[PDB]
Subunit: 90 residues, 6 copies
């Protein structure tokens, strides 16, 4: 399965910038966004593991420049069950 | 009834990582996610007591590595009334 | 009229553990759960005064072990008007 | 027009107790409740001015015993326009 | 186009008192209320510039007496684009 | 493709003042407003790079005269994927 990269920010503008930086940094698809309240929002990308790492590294740094980064994480081999509960599928 | 395992984080990325660690660690069913404002989000799994303990321990440790773990708990025998009111059923 | 027991937590996992402990401690019916944002959620039970007291005492202890208790309270004889505006009826 | 009394708490349980104490303290009708996020919720009563003062005074003190009071206020002659935008009408 | 007056509070009671003071102070139309999480809520009125200024000054002072005033502002000639996007229209 | 300007505030009144200042500073179109909780709201404009820069500079100054600015940013050339996941299109 494709790897999963995620960036979480507090603020949508930082996430939109994170998302742009991600999809331009590597061969990843922006497959989902989720807001959970408290000002926290998450963007989800899929690609190969090396792609997700380069994508999320660019996006994290991009987000830090304009807003508040909360988390950045790659799961190389995300479990199939995750797709049913979170917006990570294509 | 099956046991109930729950992890609650502040931040969705910590929760996706916890949920991944959970379903990988033991044979549990990821049976829902719930947000309640303030950035708090909870994931629920059902399995036998041994599986829910193994799942939640794995998820807790994993969430803690990348974000804010709020709560982790197993209810070995959740009361039938809970399924009516909370999204712990299948 | 039935008494009303209720617990409010900051965190859903503490509320679910509290609710389980309530319906197991006394003969009370778990009638509603409400979320009002900022992470705050409330579980409401109905039964006789002694039952709601036993239940909410047990629920409060259960909750604060694993999460944050905001409020615990019994109203022995709730006014009819509460039922039209709050989710406390059957 | 009837006077308007309002209590705002951070926490629902405090508000439910405030509401019970209000309707038992004076000849007021509990006409509405509104949650606005951040944990803030508001209960609205209508009656004569003296009723709303006694109602809100009892409710305020009731709420302070079990939770966090945010505001308590009586408008003796609330403008007609308020009814269209807020849950204060009968 | 008509001028736009807005008051924003943290807390609904402060906002209801502000709105009351507004419609009583000048000939303005209360054209909506908006909540955005965190306890923040905004009331909007439309009238001529003189009326919106009179309204918002009255509301701001009144809200301050009983709660947390966050913002108060008049836009004499709000751009047509704003009505499309925000609930300032009738 | 059009550039994307955006401002995020904690407070709706500051965002409406910022948005007014944006559409009045340059040839941009106010295309979306998003709220994500915790009081955070975002306005999004489209136009050429120079226009979004002028707009967002003006909006950021206007926002901070009356409220709290969280983020201001221009993406000169946003990726197509942003449009499928965020409200930035026409």
């Amino acid at each position: 399965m494709e790897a999963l990269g995620m960036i979480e920010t507090r603020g949508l503008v930082a996430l939109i910038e994170a998302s742009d930086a991600m999809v331009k940094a590597a061969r990843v698809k922006l497959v989902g966004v989720k807001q959970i309240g408290g000002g926290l929002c998450t963007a989800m990308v899929r690609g190969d593991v090396a792609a997700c790492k380069a994508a999320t590294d660019a996006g994290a740094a991009a987000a830090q420049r304009i807003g508040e980064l909360v988390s950045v994480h790659v799961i190389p081999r995300p479990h199939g069950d995750l797709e049913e509960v979170f917006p990570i599928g294509l």
